[PDB]
Design a protein around this ligand. Sequence first.
Ligand SMILES: *[C@@H]1O[C@H](CO)[C@@H](O)[C@H](O)[C@H]1NC(C)=O
Ligand SMILES: *[C@@H]1O[C@H](CO)[C@@H](O)[C@H](O)[C@H]1NC(C)=O
Ligand SMILES: *[C@@H]1O[C@H](CO)[C@@H](O)[C@H](O)[C@H]1NC(C)=O
Ligand SMILES: *[C@@H]1O[C@H](CO)[C@@H](O)[C@H](O)[C@H]1NC(C)=O
Ligand SMILES: [Ca+2]
Ligand SMILES: [Ca+2]
Ligand SMILES: [Ca+2]
Ligand SMILES: [Ca+2]
Ligand code: NA
Ligand code: NA
Ligand code: NA
Ligand code: NA
Lengths: 347, 347, 347, 347
Amino acid sequence: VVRRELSCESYPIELRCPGTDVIMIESANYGRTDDKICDSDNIRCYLPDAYKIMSQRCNNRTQCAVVAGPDVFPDPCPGTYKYLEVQYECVPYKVEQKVFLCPGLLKGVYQSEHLFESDHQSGAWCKDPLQASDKIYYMPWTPYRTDTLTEYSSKDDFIAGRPTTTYKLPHRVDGTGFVVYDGALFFNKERTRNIVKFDLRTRIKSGEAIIANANYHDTSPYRWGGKSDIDLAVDENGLWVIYATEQNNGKIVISQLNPYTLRIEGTWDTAYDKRSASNAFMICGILYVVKSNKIDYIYNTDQSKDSLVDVPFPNSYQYIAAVDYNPRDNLLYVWNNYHVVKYSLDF
Amino acid sequence: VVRRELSCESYPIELRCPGTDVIMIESANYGRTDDKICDSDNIRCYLPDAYKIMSQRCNNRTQCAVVAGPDVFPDPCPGTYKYLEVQYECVPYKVEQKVFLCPGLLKGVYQSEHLFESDHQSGAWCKDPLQASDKIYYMPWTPYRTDTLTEYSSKDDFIAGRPTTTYKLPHRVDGTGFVVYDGALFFNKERTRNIVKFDLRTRIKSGEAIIANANYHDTSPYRWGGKSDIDLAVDENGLWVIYATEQNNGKIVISQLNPYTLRIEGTWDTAYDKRSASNAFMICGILYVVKSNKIDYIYNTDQSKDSLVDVPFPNSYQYIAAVDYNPRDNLLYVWNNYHVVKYSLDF
Amino acid sequence: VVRRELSCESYPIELRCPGTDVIMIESANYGRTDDKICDSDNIRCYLPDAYKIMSQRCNNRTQCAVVAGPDVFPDPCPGTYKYLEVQYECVPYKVEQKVFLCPGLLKGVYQSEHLFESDHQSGAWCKDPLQASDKIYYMPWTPYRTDTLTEYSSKDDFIAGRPTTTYKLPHRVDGTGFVVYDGALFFNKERTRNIVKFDLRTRIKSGEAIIANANYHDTSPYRWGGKSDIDLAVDENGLWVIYATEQNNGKIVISQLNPYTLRIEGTWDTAYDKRSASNAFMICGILYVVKSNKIDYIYNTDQSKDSLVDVPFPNSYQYIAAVDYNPRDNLLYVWNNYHVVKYSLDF
Amino acid sequence: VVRRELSCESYPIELRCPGTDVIMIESANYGRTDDKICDSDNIRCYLPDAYKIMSQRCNNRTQCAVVAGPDVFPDPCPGTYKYLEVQYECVPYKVEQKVFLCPGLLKGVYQSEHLFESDHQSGAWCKDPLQASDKIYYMPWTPYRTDTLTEYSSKDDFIAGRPTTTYKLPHRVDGTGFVVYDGALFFNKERTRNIVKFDLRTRIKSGEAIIANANYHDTSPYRWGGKSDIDLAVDENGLWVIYATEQNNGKIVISQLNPYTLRIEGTWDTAYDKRSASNAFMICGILYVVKSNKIDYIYNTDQSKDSLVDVPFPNSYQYIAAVDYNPRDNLLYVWNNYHVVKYSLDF
Ligand SMILES: *[C@@H]1O[C@H](CO)[C@@H](O)[C@H](O)[C@H]1NC(C)=O
Ligand SMILES: *[C@@H]1O[C@H](CO)[C@@H](O)[C@H](O)[C@H]1NC(C)=O
Ligand SMILES: *[C@@H]1O[C@H](CO)[C@@H](O)[C@H](O)[C@H]1NC(C)=O
Ligand SMILES: *[C@@H]1O[C@H](CO)[C@@H](O)[C@H](O)[C@H]1NC(C)=O
Ligand SMILES: [Ca+2]
Ligand SMILES: [Ca+2]
Ligand SMILES: [Ca+2]
Ligand SMILES: [Ca+2]
Ligand code: NA
Ligand code: NA
Ligand code: NA
Ligand code: NA
């Protein structure tokens, strides 16, 4: 929706966008286009650079204050009493285009970072790839008692055990399949085949989606168990759901979930038994299944074709609780038998 | 609607309200009430003064930033890792209670201030009594060509002819009957018996009300004419409409208009011919009619009783274009034959 | 905000307002004003009655469907392919003007209706005077356990004990001082000097107001006690708060509360000790205090003048728990020692 | 956001969603879970099928009315006075999953339907693939005078020249590159490198996106010219922008545009000169370039790989003004030298 501001010469113009939304200049003029605006003692006074000046000073910002005068703008009509007229919009914060571009085909998964050894055998952690932020999101695994999400301002604060805040979730969580995308938490509602969307900035449930025919609550989890039936994943294409159905004889089923409309945007049936998989993740719309040790299966959703592979994966620890791909830094956010680690990817 | 913020010890809590809305602390606790919030190495840790500290620091403000720690709060439980949990609302800016309290019964109208002599014989001007501001709103009278409202930051800037901004109205204006109340402009839409509500902060029409059976467009104006058929008025009770109907044989009819719901909240029929009145205004729900020179008639809406009076009014100039009462400063904002003046009131 | 609809000849126009909001036609034309609208094989084709037809068919309705054709509209230009263009707004439902007009000065309170004898000694009940509805709202009094409001579709259903719905309140209630106004419940939040606004249609808290310096939780209740410290009241002027302050030595203090902005719009200090009052209510901005038996004191907020009176009140029962005035039907909604009654008023 | 309804036995529950949004049942119970709800003369009374009954009766509907009683629900506790308690959300209308699934690789483009021969040599037309509707959207090409979009209820009404409505656009349109997606019109704003989003249901601009470095206004159009610089396209992946940049030496550049966030989600540089292309379109994230006669070039965005091809295209007419792919019916919506046609696709 179009927002409007106008200030007479020597007065500032004030632009402000709600929450995390940012300014986008639609139009701007410094001069005079009307004989009634800004009462004083030439209605064809235009400054073509007014649009450029306002865009440079205000675009990508939550707020802007610009004085309508000679300190900021050249004079398009000396002698004429001028005014600054601006039309603008509040748009979601911009995202670096690399987040949506495929880095290539996965050659292997390798050790990279070892953050710390937690006192919890299972759990999950990630970053929001749509944000240029150092924020880490952490959800520990406690059977039948998980309903919180802890936020850390950096990796350094995360290792030191220094949280910024904690979120009380509207429902209990089943498994370690959680993801954070564009300021929203996505999780599997305990004892349901539903995904809950929880807005972190306003601390309220912003929606719910039913994952049609998805098996739930220790019916089709990963090898380790722990109610891992439904796993969410983020990649270059958006948000995904990794689960299994009786219709597909307990084999992995993958669906694209629109994070804004909560619609299921395409479903693909794989040939890999979910109970046999230690974990799984998406990269460029391709499902990578972990066996434990190695990636032994891939499913390409773009071609609707699968293949048997022998892609390396770290053999260090046994209890693989969570594996989350990040399309911003191209790293795997892993929870493996108490150890909180980051794995590099070779393309 | 309830808004929530939470920050772990040493981190700041950030409260922000949209537009001109202000913070109201609902609840606050600095301590520990839950064993899962703010992950670290006593769930009955309360600070009773947390509510008082937050209220003092954040109430009546657009924004607030408070660090959850020993610089701002005492320690309710030394050794326990604490967090600040706050529940708050965004409410319209508070108004000094005097604005709604009757100063008394009017003894007379007297000269007080003479701002300047305009080049326009007719027009109208006022301040928003619900705002603690020096802002002046000005609408000149130009037959069939009025569609702007000019704003000045102070009396000083108004006399000097230094405007802050100008508003382009969605429709043309009939007469000098305009008023500003709680950030909204109220005016009579040209060639209609309708009142338009225009939000000044967002620069959009926020509503419309039809003044049932009101005479319009030089049918029942004030003595001077100029399409003065419908006059808006602000007092201790709110917003009023001063007009005339054929049902009341062209005599003044007064209605209370709710500025928030746009409903007509009571209508009273007077015995004064509107065409004979130079102008009129409300004080404490009492209509005061000007003849030119003197106030010769009053109508009390609380009692539904009228009386003939001889209340003094300045005899200086003839062409009385506008008379607007202000319940904050208890002054009359008058436009009389080019002269822009303020009249004092003796109670 | 302006809403727009347009349909080519023979097609229907569909107008819809959210919730309880109603249509108000701003403008309408059946004909042709543009050479590009409604593509077919005269751009000055107007029907003046189009505005009248649309207003008659759509005003005061939640929804409207009108066919753009000869069954509903005359032909302003035969041969020319026409279209119906409408501009409209969604406004709060209209209210009969009598609700805001003073019936007169109270001569006495008299018995009228005896609905039923409840099993609860104390409680409160009312109707929403801003709605043309038979709905009754009921709140029983249970010490430290009150957090529900029950709704009945009629008097008949209320006596029979046939509820339509129950509302779970966000907080516990202190006393029997509750009121319903313009679809919103107003109550005193347990162990606070705060008034909570709860929207009944959406079932959420819509705001909160602090009653500055108000005594609360068995400090200054009515004679019967039961945490009656703060009593809400509805009359021709709007919403009121009846309470007491230490600043006024425990004597009744009355404040106008804006139900839309949650602002305190004027405060008046009375000379009647609240602990000595059995109950109190407002009519035309005048406070009427009950002693038990009789009305022995009045306070006129319009004049800021009080008087000692001897106004009759029914002597039938002793334990007067609640007295709520209704400005639509001009009756008192009373709860007296198990008996749920309506009292008439002589003006 | 969660919406709540509750009705006591024999009373109906009413669920309504705004605009085109549909109901999604979150939770439902017919019975008794609380001793205070629905006042009458067992707080563990549950009906497991209540969720199933409500979902079946209300899911995918704008509105729902269900009576809380024995005509619709079995009795989970005879003798106990029951109530129906429902929690629900309003979600965007569901979309058939085929719209997001790739039909295969394009073997050729073939003649299928010939609707009519227009009096306009150039123009554009389409359907909204996210809607299960017969609605056709039409924009004729008139140099420097295009600012309207006409809607037809069916193919039959479109051929007959019987429109339902016309939309007045906030800005003039450059070229025939328009698209309709999820109730929103997307077009290139005249003399700019910007895409405007216009909501058809509310008739207002809902956003704007700048296509960084895009050539505009007869700099890089298709062979026929007519300000075709920027072309929008819809496929299984969403919304795309087909344009050219000086950085890519006037060769086709393709970008994914998020229709909800207005963000550019990935950009790919092709090797095909845009001025040499008659038109272009996307299918499964693959760009197909038309030469006139044949498809002689493809660019796969999933692989970031291009190939020279010889894919058939109808040789019937010369002046190819628009080619729009539809992912619901897998047809090309084409405007070729006055003729309005549909082309089939062989996979
Ligand atoms: C700021 O806004 C401009 C305007 O479109 C956009 O092009 C740019 O990508 C955004 N991000 C940055 C870092 O400038
Ligand atoms: C700030 O907020 C408090 C909280 O109710 C209110 O009492 C006060 O009147 C308002 N205004 C000022 C100037 O403090
Ligand atoms: C319907 O709308 C009209 C338009 O202003 C209004 O005058 C009238 O009072 C309202 N109420 C009824 C019952 O018509
Ligand atoms: C109705 O709602 C259900 C609930 O998720 C959904 O599964 C289904 O796909 C939607 N569409 C139809 C045609 O039922
Ligand atoms: Ca995973
Ligand atoms: Ca006046
Ligand atoms: Ca009372
Ligand atoms: Ca195309
Ligand atoms: Na996951
Ligand atoms: Na006025
Ligand atoms: Na009350
Ligand atoms: Na297009």
